[PDB]
RNA sequence: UUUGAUACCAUGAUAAGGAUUAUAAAUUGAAAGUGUUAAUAUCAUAAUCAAAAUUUAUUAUUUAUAUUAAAUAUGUAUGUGUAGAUA
């Protein structure tokens, strides 16, 4: 039915009691309570499939909402919601990354108080080996790649290089 | 992938005609996104609530030297229309340019007024296989 | 797994095309939502075939006794503001209550497509006679 | 070393103090900083600043902060114990030993013990050692 | 840089510690872009204290302080990539070239299970498994036990 | 009868007289904040129309304390009054105020039955009072603290209202759905329909004496649980 | 004072694919290898953090009582359950 939802205060009774309602804002103040003004009245619907005992998914609680259109974007689903902090993507964040060494210390401390200095990574080991090798053969199918080029196109005052044949 | 139409041709495969969760595919390409309806015209492709705010990319947040194209998501206003100033956004190949102004675009956002596949075709984007392909199906003439 | 080939380059005068051809499917879009939104708006405005299928109960009844009385006298007005569209229709009987429980349970109603026809509506193809140049979603007329 | 400007905060960045993911030398950067101990931000936010003066004069008299602190002596004296506490908390630096003194003060009347231990032990062996006094 | 000596095998990688530094940004900025959405969107009042105009003054005032921050990360996280810290192969989550408690693709999982570096047990391929709770209701029941022993076994106060 | 901090009567420094400084009214900022005991910059955050107009304070009549500066006494903390329940004797009212009931009749006028009045006046010699207002909550001159220059700006760009909706927007109903709203809708009340004696009497048969069905005098929850 | 996994030649390794060890206290999925992995280097920064451009053998879609509310989410093909060929 559609109905105005109605309060009579203990004062006006032929005995005075304590209202449900009064209880409810009580219960409200106490653990701070979001009071949804706009919740119709005719929407009290169970969860059927979690809430009954006859569905073999039964556990006792409300486990979704059965609202349709419910939605990430709304406020009220904004108050009520777990915060990413210190959940499992902190975890992800922190432990799973490429050389999972570099998460429990820095490889230049550990080289350098382990073996007497840093250590090349194994990739960069094999590519030094192998021009060490196929230098000792042929040479000048090289060329020269540098980070800055300066040190090479100015050598200092001395530097040079032994010629090659 | 088949053919490399950006870098990440080479690093993606395709997996055939494979089916992903419902909503998540990777690439969010929006071929409905101008899809005309008279009666939905306010509701389809548009923010769910007419008391939302224009997005983030209708203002402008920083000091700015200037931009190129501005965002798809931004909503075409008023003022888009009046002002006069240049109105561009990033389609394919290059860039689509609202030129003509009309109050009919106003309140929607540019993916609506930005027709993402063409009927038109450059044939010359095109392998002859690709085009034989294309004749088959029955879009380019021959 | 084979190495993918490179894309051809994309055309000469070909930005061009697509401005032009992208600018003035705008402009056409104007006219063509124009055009359907005048066609939307004309259909809920004008009136519609009888909502119910009269193969069933209570409708087939003579047109002179039960639901048809209670029609007759009761609500015709409104039936006739509401313009026989089938949604209002289902809902006002629903809210005159002297049906009551029936109108989803027992009754029957025509379906979608065909209760969207308009009223004087006498053959089938009716259905498939209306324009396609309009986006409405089968409610244009 | 890097010091950063609340103030000047720019997109630009001249000084270039940001974690950049993609820069040469990077890498190690960004190791060592998904590496970083629980208060890392907090510590060190919290030792660049508000430490002992030279002279062995503590860091707690600093010109932006004092209404602050006298707010908070003024809402004790008139014994308004959770306004004060209210107000401490929005304290950036080292409060000065008075404020500890007019709160103490103030959690006497109503034998709050609980409270005045915990005001004490707060500014005690946290804070330098403001609240022996 | 320009692959001049390069440590790494692959050089794509790198992207995963990209990857972390977005979770990290996220960390950061989550608390306050919620607030910031959830005091905009309000229509209702506020709150006794603050409503009518002080409300619609406050609410345009906050989205225009959260359209000001720049480097806000509010990307969905459905949207971020999924890369193995191993070779640097993706894979769409929830679907099954993605392995998501150890967070490799299916390659790297196959690779690492097949060479024993994983430590698994081997089920029949084609059923529910060992547990209880799969052989009941499947992805979805065991989804729900999950929420129901992180959050509902509290009664919060 | 212990008193909570800053009761919600604000204290309101008036201009009058003042210091020796004019022996006319004050006039600077500085000098109220002197005697306020409090910072000039708290002064200026309560007073919005005060600080925008001028700091000399021209023409602007009061000035208004910071929440800090509130002194509460018991005549504005605790209701002066007390309802009167249906089944009330005096007895019973002083036994719930704790008051002696002669007291209780001395600022009543030596009342005896109860029976026609809405409230009695309460004793100051009363134990248990009734707080005019709930204690745990926040006056509201703390949240307009952290408002100030809002609502300077409102006074500035003189703004009455900003509208929320259309203009036309109730005629149009599944169109502004605001993202509190909820499904089901609730149609607009009808004023005999809760019952069948009701609707009767007002709709079909118009001289039916019993114009609606007997009515429990305690609350009935029709919406349950 | 250095030069390879790169957009680029630059070995290894796990897929799919029923055809004769049968009933009792018992499994209807196989090794012959399907992008990403370890010694051949000597053109080039091409990698997602959103909102994006169909030609690709290798894919089970909702078919006539009631039909767009929250991340934005598909306008098209009614035609005698009707060729060939296929699962
Ligand atoms: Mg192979
Ligand atoms: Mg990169």
């Known amino acids: 039915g559609v109905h105005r939802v109605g309060y009579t205060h203990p004062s006006t009774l032929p005995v005075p009691c304590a209202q449900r309602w009064d209880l409810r804002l009580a219960r409200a103040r106490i653990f701070q309570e979001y009071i949804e003004e706009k919740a119709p009245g005719a929407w009290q619907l169970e969860d059927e499939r979690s809430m009954s005992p006859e569905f073999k998914t039964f556990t006792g609680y409300p486990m979704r909402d059965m609202r349709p259109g419910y939605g990430q974007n709304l406020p009220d689903y904004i108050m009520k919601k777990r915060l990413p902090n210190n959940t499992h993507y902190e975890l992800f964040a922190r432990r799973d990354i490429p050389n999972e060494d570099n998460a429990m210390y820095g490889k230049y401390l550990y080289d350098m108080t382990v073996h007497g200095t840093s250590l090349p990574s194994t990739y960069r080991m094999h590519k030094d080996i192998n021009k060490a090798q196929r230098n000792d053969r042929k040479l000048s199918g090289n060329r020269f790649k540098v980070l800055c080029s300066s040190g090479a196109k100015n050598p200092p005052s001395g530097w040079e290089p032994i010629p090659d044949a | 992938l088949k053919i490399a139409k950006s870098a990440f041709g080479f690093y993606l495969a395709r997996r055939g005609q494979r089916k992903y969760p419902f909503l998540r595919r990777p690439h969010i390409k929006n071929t409905h996104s101008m899809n005309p309806s008279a009666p939905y015209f306010w509701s389809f492709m548009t923010a769910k609530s007419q008391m939302a705010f224009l997005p983030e990319e209708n203002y402008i947040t920083g000091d700015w030297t200037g931009k190129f194209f501005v965002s798809k998501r931004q909503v075409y206003t008023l003022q888009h229309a009046t002002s006069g100033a240049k109105v561009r956004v990033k389609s394919f190949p290059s860039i689509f340019e609202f030129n003509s102004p009309s109050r009919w675009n106003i309140g929607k956002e540019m993916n609506t007024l930005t027709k993402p596949r063409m009927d038109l075709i450059d044939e010359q984007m095109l392998t002859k296989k690709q085009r034989l392909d294309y004749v088959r199906a029955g879009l380019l003439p021959k | 797994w084979a190495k993918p080939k490179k894309r051809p380059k994309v055309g000469q005068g070909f930005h061009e095309k697509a401005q032009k051809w992208r600018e003035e499917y705008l402009l056409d879009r104007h006219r063509a939502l124009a055009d359907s939104l005048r066609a939307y708006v004309e259909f809920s405005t004008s009136k519609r075939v009888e909502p119910w299928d009269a193969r069933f109960k209570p409708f087939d009844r003579i047109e002179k006794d039960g639901v048809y009385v209670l029609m007759r006298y009761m609500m015709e007005e409104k039936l006739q503001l509401c313009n026989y569209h089938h949604r209002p229709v289902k809902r006002l009987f629903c809210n005159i209550g002297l049906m009551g429980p029936q109108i989803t349970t027992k009754a029957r109603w025509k379906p979608y497509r065909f209760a969207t026809n308009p009223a004087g509506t006498s053959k089938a193809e009716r259905m498939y006679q209306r324009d396609k140049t309009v986006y409405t979603h089968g409610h244009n007329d | 070393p890097a010091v950063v400007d609340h103030d000047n905060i720019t997109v630009e960045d001249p000084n270039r103090v940001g974690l950049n993911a993609a820069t040469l030398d990077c890498r190690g950067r960004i190791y060592r900083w998904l590496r970083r101990g629980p208060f890392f931000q907090v510590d060190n936010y919290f030792r660049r600043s508000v430490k002992l003066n030279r002279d062995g004069t503590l860091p707690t008299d600093f010109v932006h902060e004092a209404p602050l602190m006298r707010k908070i002596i003024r809402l004790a004296h008139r014994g308004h114990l959770k306004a004060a506490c209210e107000e401490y908390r929005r304290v950036t630096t080292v409060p000065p030993v008075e404020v500890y003194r007019a709160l103490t003060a103030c959690c006497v009347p109503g034998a709050k013990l609980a409270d005045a231990v915990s005001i004490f032990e707060d500014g005690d062996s946290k804070l330098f050692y403001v609240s022996r006094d | 840089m320009r692959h001049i000596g390069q440590d790494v095998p692959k050089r794509h990688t790198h992207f995963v510690l990209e990857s972390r530094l977005m979770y990290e940004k996220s960390f950061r900025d989550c608390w306050l872009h919620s607030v910031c959405r959830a005091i905009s969107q309000l229509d209702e009042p506020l709150s006794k204290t603050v409503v009518g105009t002080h409300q619609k003054m406050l609410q345009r005032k906050v989205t225009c302080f959260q359209y000001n921050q720049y480097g806000l990360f509010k990307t969905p996280y459905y949207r971020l990539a999924n890369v193995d810290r191993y070779h640097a192969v993706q894979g769409v989550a929830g679907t099954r070239e993605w392995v998501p408690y150890v967070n490799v693709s299916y390659w790297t999982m196959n690779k690492m299970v097949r060479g024993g570096n994983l430590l698994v047990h081997r089920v029949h391929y084609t059923g529910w498994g060992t547990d209880s709770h799969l052989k009941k209701g499947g992805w979805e029941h065991r989804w729900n036990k999950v929420l129901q022993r992180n959050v509902l076994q509290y009664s919060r106060i | ?225």
Not at chain 6, 112 to 133: I, K, N, Q, W
Not at chain 6, 157 to 162: A, D, G, H, Q
Not at chain 6, 177 to 189: K, L, M
């Open chain 6, 1 to 225: 009868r212990r008193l909570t901090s800053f009761g919600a009567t604000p204290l309101v420094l008036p201009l009058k007289t003042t210091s020796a400084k004019d022996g006319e009214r004050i006039r600077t900022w500085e000098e109220a904040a002197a005697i306020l005991d409090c910072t000039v910059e708290e002064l200026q955050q309560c007073n919005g129309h005060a600080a925008l107009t001028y700091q000399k304070k021209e023409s602007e009549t009061e000035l208004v304390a910071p929440l800090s500066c509130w002194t509460s006494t018991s005549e504005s903390e605790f209701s002066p009054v007390e309802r009167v329940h249906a089944n009330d004797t005096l007895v019973a009212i002083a036994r719930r105020l704790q008051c002696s009931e002669e007291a209780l009749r001395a600022v009543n006028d030596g009342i005896t039955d109860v029976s026609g009045l809405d409230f009695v006046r309460v004793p100051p010699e009363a134990r248990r009072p009734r707080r005019l207002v709930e204690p745990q909550l926040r006056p509201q001159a703390a949240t307009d603290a952290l408002l100030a220059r809002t609502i300077a700006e409102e006074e500035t760009f003189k703004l009455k209202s900003i509208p929320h909706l259309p203009q036309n927007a109730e005629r149009f109903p599944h169109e502004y759905h605001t993202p509190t709203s909820r499904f089901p809708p609730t149609p607009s009340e009808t004023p005999a329909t809760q019952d069948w004696m009701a609707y009767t009497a007002k709709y079909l048969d118009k001289q039916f004496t019993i114009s609606a069905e007997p009515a429990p005098v305690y609350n009935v929850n029709k919406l349950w649980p």
